[PDB]
């Protein structure tokens, strides 16, 4: 389980290859479910699967 800035969810927080632009905070699936997230402390990008 996780909570990122109030984004509750569950998954395996794989280290992402996705090339987030510096303004982007979250990634979304084709459904509106959250597909990736920036860590609010390290500001790395994680996949959520």
């Amino acid at each position: 389980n996780f909570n990122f800035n109030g984004l509750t969810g569950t998954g395996v927080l794989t280290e992402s290859n996705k090339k987030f632009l510096p303004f982007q905070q979250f990634g979304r699936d084709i459904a509106d479910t959250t597909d990736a997230v920036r860590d609010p402390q390290t500001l790395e990008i994680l996949d959520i699967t």
Binding site: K18, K19, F20, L21, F23, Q24, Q25, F26, G27, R28, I30, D35, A36
Partner: protein, 206 residues
């Protein structure tokens, strides 16, 4: 004088990474092949529901912008000045002069905000009490005409600052620039495998 927008003026409508997907967004965009005003002077231009602004310079001729309902100390006015060293963003009841050549203002009062940090391209939005800047600087073959082809502006600055804007101006040092107005349009945006917007359909165009 006027010119076509030539499919420029797309920007990322969300702070959301999207990739390998086509996304529809109803948002304030410069329409494809819209009728942009052209300049070389710096009038008290209308701002409407938002502006695409672009300029081509080789010697840093433009030095920023100012915005408000009056551009007078009766109301708060937003200023962005790019001085010789810094980008300075201020919100005050400024007393501006007749031309903001660089002597932009005599004084400032009742201040509420500050922020500090080729073809140049910008989009300005002022919606629901935010003000947002998107931009790109684009290398191009010539110094004085707006190009063909497509690229999407990245978000630059983003301010929770609550001003009311109907007028704006261009600041100048002691060059060709273009102004286009955003419309509420549905755009189908192509986000590629790197999640950059590479192309768009203006669903209203034809």
């Amino acid at each position: 004088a006027y010119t076509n927008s030539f499919t420029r003026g797309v920007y990322y409508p969300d702070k959301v990474f999207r990739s390998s997907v086509l996304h529809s967004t109803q948002d304030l965009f410069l329409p494809f092949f819209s009728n942009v005003t052209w300049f070389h002077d710096n009038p008290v231009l209308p701002f409407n529901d938002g502006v695409y602004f672009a300029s081509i310079e080789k010697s840093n001729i433009i030095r920023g912008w100012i915005f408000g309902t009056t551009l007078d100390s009766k109301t708060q006015s937003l200023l962005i000045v790019n001085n010789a060293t810094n980008v300075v963003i201020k919100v005050c009841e400024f007393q501006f002069c007749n031309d903001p050549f660089l002597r932009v203002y005599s004084s400032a009062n009742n201040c509420t905000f500050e922020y500090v940090s080729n073809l140049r391209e910008f989009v300005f939005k002022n919606i629901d009490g935010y003000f947002k800047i998107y931009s790109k600087h684009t290398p191009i073959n010539l110094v004085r005409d707006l190009p063909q082809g497509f690229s999407a502006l990245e978000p630059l600055v983003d301010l929770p600052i609550g001003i009311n804007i109907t007028r704006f101006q261009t600041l100048l040092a002691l060059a060709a620039y273009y102004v286009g107005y955003l419309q509420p349009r549905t755009f189908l945006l192509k986000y590629n495998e790197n999640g950059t917007i590479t192309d768009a359909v203006d669903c209203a165009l034809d």
